[PDB]
Amino acid sequence: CRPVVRRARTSDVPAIKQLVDTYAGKILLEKNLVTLYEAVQEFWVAEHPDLYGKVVGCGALHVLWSDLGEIRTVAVDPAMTGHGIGHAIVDRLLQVARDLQLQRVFVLTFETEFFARHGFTEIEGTPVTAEVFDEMCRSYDIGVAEFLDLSYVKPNILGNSRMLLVL
Amino acid sequence: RDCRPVVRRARTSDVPAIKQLVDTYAGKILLEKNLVTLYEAVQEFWVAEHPDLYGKVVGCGALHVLWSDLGEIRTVAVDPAMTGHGIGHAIVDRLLQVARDLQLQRVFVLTFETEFFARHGFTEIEGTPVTAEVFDEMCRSYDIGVAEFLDLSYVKPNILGNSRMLLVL
Ligand SMILES: CC(=O)SCCNC(=O)CCNC(=O)[C@H](O)C(C)(C)COP(=O)(O)OP(=O)(O)OC[C@H]1O[C@@H](n2cnc3c(N)ncnc32)[C@H](O)[C@@H]1OP(=O)(O)O
Ligand SMILES: CC(=O)SCCNC(=O)CCNC(=O)[C@H](O)C(C)(C)COP(=O)(O)OP(=O)(O)OC[C@H]1O[C@@H](n2cnc3c(N)ncnc32)[C@H](O)[C@@H]1OP(=O)(O)O
Ligand SMILES: N[C@@H](CCC(=O)O)C(=O)O
Ligand SMILES: N[C@@H](CCC(=O)O)C(=O)O
DSSP states (O other), rough: OOOOOOOGGGGHHHHHHHHHHBTTTTEEEEEOHHHHHTGGGGGGEEEGGGGGEEEEEEEEEEEEEEEEEEEEEEEEEGGGGSSSSSHHHHHHHHHHHHHTSEEEEEEEEHHHHHTTTOOEEEOOOOOHHHHHHHHHHHHHHHHHHHOOOHHEEEEESSEEEEEEEEE | OOOOOOOOOOOOOGHHHHHHHHHHTTTTTBBBHHHHHHTTGGGEEEEEEEEETTTTTTEEEEEEEEEEEEEEEEEEEEEEGGGGGSSSHHHHHHHHHHHTTTOOOEEOOOOOOOOOOOOTEEOOOOOOOHHHHHHHHHHHSSSSHTTOOOOHHHSSSSSSOOOEEEEOO
């Protein structure tokens, strides 16, 4: 299995949404269409080569600061799991992270083994509320960035695990 | 065109240069932008390299996707010492190609540089701007149903009192 992983187009957003909706709830955070469209340039999709490039998976990398990214919304069609599509997507995202000149990537996930294959290690966060987080983000600049590591404080909504990768 | 520069995807390392370009024109000409905004939006940004000066960033531009069929051109800026040589146009050429690649159907822009954008096929349009507060209510409601009747390009607030222009791809 050699999925093609490529940058998303607006035309893939429906398939992305469908993927999210499959797992949305206590596993993945819900996303509406407008949110996805706006984020489209963060998104990569996996194609099924034998099936004419049909989209069977997705993932996103979101930039927080000059040195830090977060992987989000990685999902694979439940009928296509276990063939390396997932790992392919993550591989791509990490390369993008490198190309962008990021130094670290974090993720919030229940799939700790999956991510551990990529070198992610579980860390103990200091999560805050959404409100506190919004305060932090509003103040965020060079000075604040000196002492505040967003990877540690990013809210944990689903109650999953926090993991970190040093590029 | 004098300068046919390399136009490439932004990196986080480029953001200080981008910020410098924006701050050069910010206020009346361009909407200001802090570092955090820029970092988050980095993946929307393209930069123009000086062909001889160690690839130094001498221009920038971005495209922002609003909905399946619509995008907006933002924060296009060129080093003042390097203007009039085709860098601007090279940037916009790229953004427009990105738009097409993305499967956008239309692109808009809010600008004082009307002749510049007209070169790329943009025509002025009669906006019906709303307040920022209203625009935010609109965005919070936005979905397939609303998009049926509400064209965000007509209503996006005009902060700077410039011209509103549209391009059908
Ligand atoms: C921020 C976030 O997104 S949080 C992250 C997680 N997202 C989710 O939980 C959403 C719901 N879950 C899913 O969509 C999927 O189950 C995913 C994304 C977790 C995994 O997708 P999969 O496509 O099954 O992943 P992939 O197939 O690459 O790997 C799974 C197993 O297949 C096998 N496999 C791995 N690589 C390959 C390969 N190259 N070729 C063949 N088989 C492989 C391995 O046995 C592997 O197990 P591992 O997890 O121990 O490495
Ligand atoms: C959302 C938004 O971005 S709003 C719009 C853009 N932003 C701004 O206004 C920010 C401030 N302005 C700037 O940074 C610049 O002046 C820009 C971006 C508007 C123009 O950049 P430039 O690099 O000067 O663009 P470029 O050289 O391609 O400009 C073309 C003009 O200069 C002259 N010119 C351009 N290329 C050449 C060339 N190769 N040889 C000779 N003359 C040229 C032409 O007269 C042309 O006229 P036009 O304005 O009718 O097209
Ligand atoms: N990748 C993020 C979007 C990040 C953002 O643009 O805020 C998501 O899946 O929603
Ligand atoms: N491209 C926009 C940002 C778009 C966004 O909200 O992501 C800018 O010039 O900052």
